Amino acid sequence: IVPTRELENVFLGRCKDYEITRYLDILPRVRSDCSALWKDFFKAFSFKNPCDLDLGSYKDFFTSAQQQLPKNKVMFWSGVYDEAHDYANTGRKYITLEDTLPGYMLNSLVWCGQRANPGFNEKVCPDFKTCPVQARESFWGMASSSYAHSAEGEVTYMVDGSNPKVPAYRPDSFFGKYELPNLTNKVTRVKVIVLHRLGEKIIEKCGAGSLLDLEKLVKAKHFAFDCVENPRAVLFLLCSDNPNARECRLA
Amino acid sequence: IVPTRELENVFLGRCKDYEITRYLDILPRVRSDCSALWKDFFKAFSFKNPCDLDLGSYKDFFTSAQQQLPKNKVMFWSGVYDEAHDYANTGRKYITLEDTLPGYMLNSLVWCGQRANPGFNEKVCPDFKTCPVQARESFWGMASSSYAHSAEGEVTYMVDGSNPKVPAYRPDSFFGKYELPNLTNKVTRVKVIVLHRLGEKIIEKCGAGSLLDLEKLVKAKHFAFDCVENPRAVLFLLCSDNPNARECRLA
Ligand SMILES: Nc1nc(=O)c2ncn([C@@H]3O[C@H](COP(=O)(O)OP(=O)(O)OC[C@H]4OC[C@H](O)[C@@H]4O)[C@@H](O)[C@H]3O)c2[nH]1
Ligand SMILES: Nc1nc(=O)c2ncn([C@@H]3O[C@H](COP(=O)(O)OP(=O)(O)OC[C@H]4OC[C@H](O)[C@@H]4O)[C@@H](O)[C@H]3O)c2[nH]1
């Protein structure tokens, strides 16, 4: 795995771009400036073995970078990156982690520590299947935890109901590990959107299988629950990429 | 209008973000430094009255920032910003100006010259509706000229076929003034997509009115031509935002 070149300049430029021009009437600005956020992010991993991290490593960075999130708008997603982010629509309909400042800054980036100067590796990072899980998930797991902990009102969760190999809800996804269990009593309701991919066998349904497990967990955390499969607004987005599909037939 | 804050920092950050991380497998990198782009850009408007620009002003910036564009994937749009960009899909289906380095760096920014130090106005810029035509259009007009100049193969032009106040095709739009005249013999075909917004009345149709004007122009420059109104992939995208529209009735 190749680390991102010029990591600090990419971080600092995305940061400033965001601060001044991104999600302006959608998410609040952070108090800390871009240089103070870099200091917190860099110290989490710098000057240490690339596997020497834990879930507390970026704690100071996420405290500085966390934004209050708009009630009823927070979305989580598993196995449907593209469909969830198309539907959420750059913050216009829902917020995803990828719209928040830290999620926007680090999305797709690749970085790791080293002990020798300059304290990070610009040549290679290890396959993180090689590091303990708490190190491998130190950044995105704490991102998901801090994100979910800030959610208020109804939350939305979009899942894949057509994957034979991967249940729609599973406790070991980032959602199952970091998000569902970290929703606070300021959350009222979990609304599940199940994707039934076009022209494919339906593997999971509302009220059965892992959606029923998920329903039970939601009610045990004392929230309301509802679930829908291909609501129309979402079906039309699917149809846009596959217009000849049977499900998309008009009048 | 209020100008963008920290224009240099925004421009440089967006520049560096793009360079390293954006459109990597879709559009080539430019040879120039972010600092060398900023100098060409700033000198175009700095230390001048705000309305003192013409088509020529930004010439060096656009010569530096110009990327070779993927054959057949170049899209133009008039009056349908949001729908054209949703369908083009961040470069996956088509390229728009806003996906290229200069379009990305300046998209939605506001800036203007002044003559006293620091050479730009950080308080107020005129609605350039106060400036002469060639000064209003100095930047985006020269952007559109240079973009159109680099297209090869088929190009696609999406227009609004439902605006009673503005014809689908206009010789004085950016497309008629800056894009169409600059298509080279490397271009083989102009493919028009007419949008008919849902539950609104139909104003323009292929083969008639201003689209007929456009068809004759295109063929006289020796390009093939075709035209379609709400092709299904675009329709489904319109329906996803208004699923109750009668045009969206499912089988
Ligand atoms: N957005 C992102 N960019 C990256 O560069 C990255 N690298 C690792 N990850 C992690 O890999 C995960 C994708 O694995 P899935 O099976 O499709 O589904 P879940 O496992 O439930 O992830 C989705 C949840 O976390 C985010 C969001 O809030 C959502 O609810 C990323 O989420 C992220 O934590 C990343 N996530
Ligand atoms: N901020 C901003 N960013 C942009 O990327 C941009 N692109 C155009 N404009 C301005 O938005 C205004 C809207 O004018 P219209 O009737 O919707 O369409 P046309 O006049 O045909 O301009 C659109 C074509 O040129 C650009 C692109 O390649 C597209 O093909 C225009 O005065 C244009 O100068 C822009 N303004």
> Helix/strand/coil (H, E, C) string of chain B?
CCCCCCHHHHHHHHHHHHHHHCCCCCCCCCCCCHHHHHHHHHHHHCCCCCCCCCCCCCHHHHHHHCCCCCCCCEEEEECCHHHHHHHHCCCCCCECHHHCHHHHHHCCCCCCECCCCCCECCCCCCCHHHCCHHHHCHHHHHHHHHHHHHCCEEEEEEEECCCCCCCCCCCCCHHHHHHHHHCCCCEEEEEEEEECCCCCCCCCCCCCHHHHHHHHHHHHCCCEEEEEECCHHHHHHHHHHCCCCHHHCEC
Q: Which of A78, A108, A163, A182 best tests ligand 1's pocket when mutated (most atoms within 8 Å of CB)? A: A78
Contact B135/B52 with Cβ under 8 angstroms?
Answer: yes
- A79 CB within 6 A, ligand 1: yes
CA atoms within 13 Å, Cβ hemisphere of A86:
23
Query: If you measure CA to CA, which chain A residue comes closest to B87?
Result: A240
Using DSSP bridges, classify how beta strands A74-78 and A224-229 pair: parallel, antiparallel or unpaired. unpaired
Tokens coding A174: 């980032």
Question: Rounded distance, CA A71 to CA A36, Å?
Answer: 28
| CA-to-CA separations, B14 to A13, A21, B218, in angstroms, rounded | 6, 10, 36
A-proximal residues of B, 97-116, CB under 8 Å: 108-109
Start-end ranges of CATH 1.20.82.10 in chain B? Answer: 1-67+100-151
Tokens coding B158: 């999406």
Q: Atom of ligand 1 at shortest distance to CA of A140?
A: 34
Give the CA angle between residues A39, A41, A45 to the nearest 5°. Answer: 110
Contact A3/A124 with Cβ under 8 angstroms?
Answer: yes
Tokens coding A153: 């009102």
Tokens coding B12: 């440089």
Secondary element (H or E) of residue A145: helix A138-150
In a mutational test of the A interface, the residue from B2, B230, B236 whose CB has the highest number of chain A CBs within 10 Å is B236
Tokens coding A146: 């801090």
Query: B156 forms bridges with which residues in the sheet?
Result: B75, B191
Q: Which residue has the tokens 């800390």?
A: A32
Question: Rounded distance, CA A58 to CA A41, Å?
Answer: 6
Closest Cα in chain A, distance from residue B182 (Å): 32
- B174 CB within 6 A, ligand 2: yes
Closest Cα in chain B, distance from residue A101 (Å): 15
**DSSP label of A65:** H
Tokens coding A7: 């990591």
DSSP annotation string for A70-107: -TT-EEEEES-HHHHHHHHTTTTS-B-GGGSHHHHHHT
| CA-to-CA separations, B166 to B75, B169, B177, B203, in angstroms, rounded | 20, 8, 15, 9
Contact B8/B38 with Cβ under 8 angstroms?
Answer: yes
Q: Ligand 1 centre from A179 Cα, in Å?
A: 11
Start-end ranges of CATH 3.40.50.720 in chain B? Answer: 68-99+152-251
Contact B53/B132 with Cβ under 8 angstroms?
Answer: no
Which of A13, A236, A249 has the CB atom closest to B240's CB atom? A236
Active-site residue A179, yes or no? yes
Question: Rounded distance, CA B190 to CA A202, Å?
Answer: 41
Residues 6 or more apart whose Cβ sits within 8 Å of residue A186: A151, A152, A153
Question: Rounded distance, CA B89 to CA B114, Å?
Answer: 37
Tokens coding A76: 């989580």
Active-site residue A83, yes or no? no
Tokens coding A175: 């959602």
Largest Cα separation within chain A, whole Å, is 66
Question: Rounded distance, CA A115 to CA A113, Å?
Answer: 7
B92 touches chain A (CB under 8 A): no
Contact B162/B203 with Cβ under 8 angstroms?
Answer: yes
B236 touches chain A (CB under 8 A): yes
Around Cβ A85, how many Cβ atoms within 10 Å?
17
CATH code given to domain B68-99+152-251: 3.40.50.720
Resolution in A: 2.0
Question: Rounded distance, CA B133 to CA B174, Å?
Answer: 11
Question: Rounded distance, CA B62 to CA B66, Å?
Answer: 6
Active-site residue B98, yes or no? yes
Tallying the residues shown for chain A, one arrives at: 251
Q: Which residue in the list A137, A152, A179, A204 is annotated as catalytic?
A: A179
DSSP annotation string for A9-35: HHHHHHHHHHHHHSSTTTSPPPSS-HH
Tokens coding B174: 């950016």
| CA-to-CA separations, B80 to A23, A44, A95, A240, in angstroms, rounded | 21, 45, 24, 17
Contact A16 B13 (CB under 8 A): yes
List the determination method: X-ray
Tokens coding A216: 């039970």
- B78 CB within 6 A, ligand 2: yes
Query: B190 forms bridges with which residues in the sheet?
Result: B155, B225
Contact A44/A64 with Cβ under 8 angstroms?
Answer: no
> What residue ranges in chain A does DSSP mark as E strands?
74-78, 153-160, 187-195, 224-229
Question: Rounded distance, CA A233 to CA A246, Å?
Answer: 17
Our CA dihedral for A169, A175, A177, A183, rounded to 10 degrees, sits at -110
A184 touches chain B (CB under 8 A): no
Query: B250 forms bridges with which residues in the sheet?
Result: A250
Using DSSP bridges, classify how beta strands A224-229 and B224-229 pair: parallel, antiparallel or unpaired. unpaired
Tokens coding A244: 């000849």
In a mutational test of the A interface, the residue from B4, B14, B18, B20 whose CB has the highest number of chain A CBs within 10 Å is B20
How is domain A1-67+100-151 classified at the CATH fold level?
Answer: ADP Ribosyl Cyclase; Chain A, domain 1 (1.20.82)
